[PDB]
Amino acid sequence: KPDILWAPHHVDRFVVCDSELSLYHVESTVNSLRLSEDSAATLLSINSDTPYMKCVAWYLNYDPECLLAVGQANGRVVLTSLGQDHNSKFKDLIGKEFVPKHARQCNTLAWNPLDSNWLAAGLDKHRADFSVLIWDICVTKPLYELGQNDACLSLCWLPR
Amino acid sequence: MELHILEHRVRVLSVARPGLWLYTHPLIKLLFLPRRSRCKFFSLTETPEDYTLMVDEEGFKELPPSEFLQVAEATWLVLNVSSAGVTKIARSVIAPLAEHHVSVLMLSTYQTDFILVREQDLSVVIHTLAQEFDIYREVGGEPVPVTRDDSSVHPIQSPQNRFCVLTLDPETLPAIATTLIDVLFYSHSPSSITFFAFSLIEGYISIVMDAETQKKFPSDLLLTSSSGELWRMVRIGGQPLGIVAQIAGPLAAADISAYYISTFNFAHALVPEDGIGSVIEVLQRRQEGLAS
Amino acid sequence: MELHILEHRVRVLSVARPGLWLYTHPLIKLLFLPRRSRCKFFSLTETPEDYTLMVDEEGFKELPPSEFLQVAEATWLVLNVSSTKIARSVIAPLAEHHVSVLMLSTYQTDFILVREQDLSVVIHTLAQEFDIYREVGGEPVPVTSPTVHPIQSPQNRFCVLTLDPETLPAIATTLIDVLFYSHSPSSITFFAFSLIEGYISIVMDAETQKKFPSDLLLTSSSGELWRMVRIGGQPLGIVAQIAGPLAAADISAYYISTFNFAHALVPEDGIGSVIEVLQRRQ
Secondary structure: OOEEEEOOOOOOEEEEEOOOEEEEEEEOOOOOOEOOOOOEEEEEEEEOOOOOEEEEEEOOOOOOOOEEEEEEOOOOEEEEEOOOOOOOOOOOOOOOEEOOOOOOOEEEEEEOOOOOOOEEEEEOOOOOOOOEEEOOOOOOOOOEEEOOOOOOOOOOOOOO | OEEEEOOOOOEEEEEOOOOOHHHHHHHHHHHHOHHHOOOOEEEEEEOOOOEEEEEOHHHHOOOOOOOOEEOOOOOOOOEEEEOOOHHHHHHHHHOOOOOOOOOOEEEEOOOOEEEEOOHHHOOHHHHHOOOOOEEEEOOOOOOEEOOOOOOOOOOOOOOOOOEEEEEOOOOOHHHOHHHHHHHHHHOOOOOOOOOEEEEEEOOEEEEEEEHHHHOOOOOOOOEOOOOOOOEEEOOEOOOOOOOOHHHHOOOOOOOOOOOOOEOOOOEOOEEEOOOOHHHHHHHHHOOOOOOO | OOOOEEEEEEEEEEEOOOOOHHHHHHHHHHHHOOOOOOOOEEEEEEOOOOEEEEEEHHHHOOOOOOOOEEEOOOOEEEEOOOOOOOHHHHHHHHHHHOOOOEEEOOOOOOOEEEOOOOOOOHHHHHOOOOOOOOEEOOEEOOOOOOOOOOEEOOOOOEEEEEOOHHHOHHHHHHHHHHHHOOOOOOOOOOEEEEEEOOEEEEEEOHHHHOOOOOOOOEOOOOOOOEEEEEEOOOOOOOHHHHHHHHHOOOOOOOOEEOOOOEEEEEEOOOHHHHHHHHOOOO
């Protein structure tokens, strides 16, 4: 089912996640789609190059433009970026994909809010595979990895 | 380190080769049409000799009794073990149960590894490995612990083709059903053998098909390991019904991730294709002396 | 106006509703997999009395003739008119010389199925108003009872359809459900399937339609549905009774014949006259 997302430091930019990814801007033309009797929505970009998606998440470092992590039903995670996406001090992050050493559905993804270079992925069950993997954005090898012959259904980071 | 006795009270039966077409109405229901049947345990595999059908009691009623189908003697139960590789499970289960001989079939899967015992053995089994990992039978969201309060051959036929073990997305099976149905029972008119295995277990799919038969299906819609590593099998024979014990125990003394499958007559096995000169010769040396 | 005599020799069979699980093997083969079977003419219709199987000689070879099957002794022949002028030009002249005609419409063309031995008498009559041909080996060489079955009127709705033969599998499972699983003074079961020379025409009711995807299936662009008229009968001059005294009003018609009955659809707005058509007694 489609969800919604607010960009971590943006004040008026939300992203609609559906069969196709969409980015909107809350238009404040009250004195000058329709949101309410004080604002409407404007579109700035769109992308549908990730068919059969499962879950989405937002990057938070400060501004590699606007990164977005999506998880396919095969088990791979692909980082995608919408917007201007020009003049970035770190612009090679786009396009990578972390393949597990098997094929299973991906349930949840999350970021550690202390250092922005840790991404956590959960996958369905298998006979001889690590269920949870912690990657490193800066691929054939996860940094750490936990679990064996079990399934992860939800993740979160303790901010302590 | 825990053992769970589940409640899917399975029932085995053998479908003869010529007259499958009687049992075509029910099977299509079970495989691709979930919401029309209550049964939640189904796994079938095909061999040149015959057809083997695993199903629980709910699905049993649908199958009509013909003269093409001998069924079973006893209502097999199901066990499962969890935290531990395939070698660990085999060494700690299959041979200790062989120490005093109540035989057992093992059905594997891309998700777990099931064990199917017989009803009369539920005292002897719990009496044997009660000196081991945690044991608690599951009834409900939380299992109900079981307390022990008081209780006192032939050579290897080795087909030389390549297999591929792979899963499927349940929200995708309709897009494949037609191509899959043609394989199962429509296109059925020494160095190679034929093998198909289907298994729907509590919402998970594991199937085993030859590499040649794999080319028919689409590419990105399947689900397989990420390097393309096939397998190769070692078929053993037997009487018209254990066989798996003397296929597992001798090759239990290693670090090889065996993948077992069982039928009525045959009792299979699988190994990673990269190295076979180990498996081939180990059982040959473990045949001499052991035999006589 | 030309009049061709196509090649297929057709057999008509009718299987009972209770024991259809025996015959599910050949039917899926004939329907869904083209390359497996060698056929060009196959039509199946669902009625509460029984099922109806119209197949060819090749298709007939794939039937295990158990004691749930009935078969007529004769072998029909297919015709066409390909050059509202059907009932008053072919069917109406037919009854005079005491022949029998079954009819099987279709989304793409129409069809007539004369009998097997009545081959000399059929081209005897119609020849006056139309030159006759005969498709021989791909090249058409041009050479030369008084029992009024009372009327029913199902309250249902209906919709004609077509779908391209590429994207049949995407529907396959759902349709497999409908014909064999989801079946166990109105609301009558009706489903008709036609696979003719590589064309697919099917008739289904509105409620059932809300299951398939609303894009793939192809039909009219205003959703004009059809009502129905149904007449009973003994045989196997029966399709004529509803056809003859209907032509007088000169309205549209979608005849679908069956083993023992005779059906004929009519567009939605306009039943209030076609019902009245036979309300002039006979």
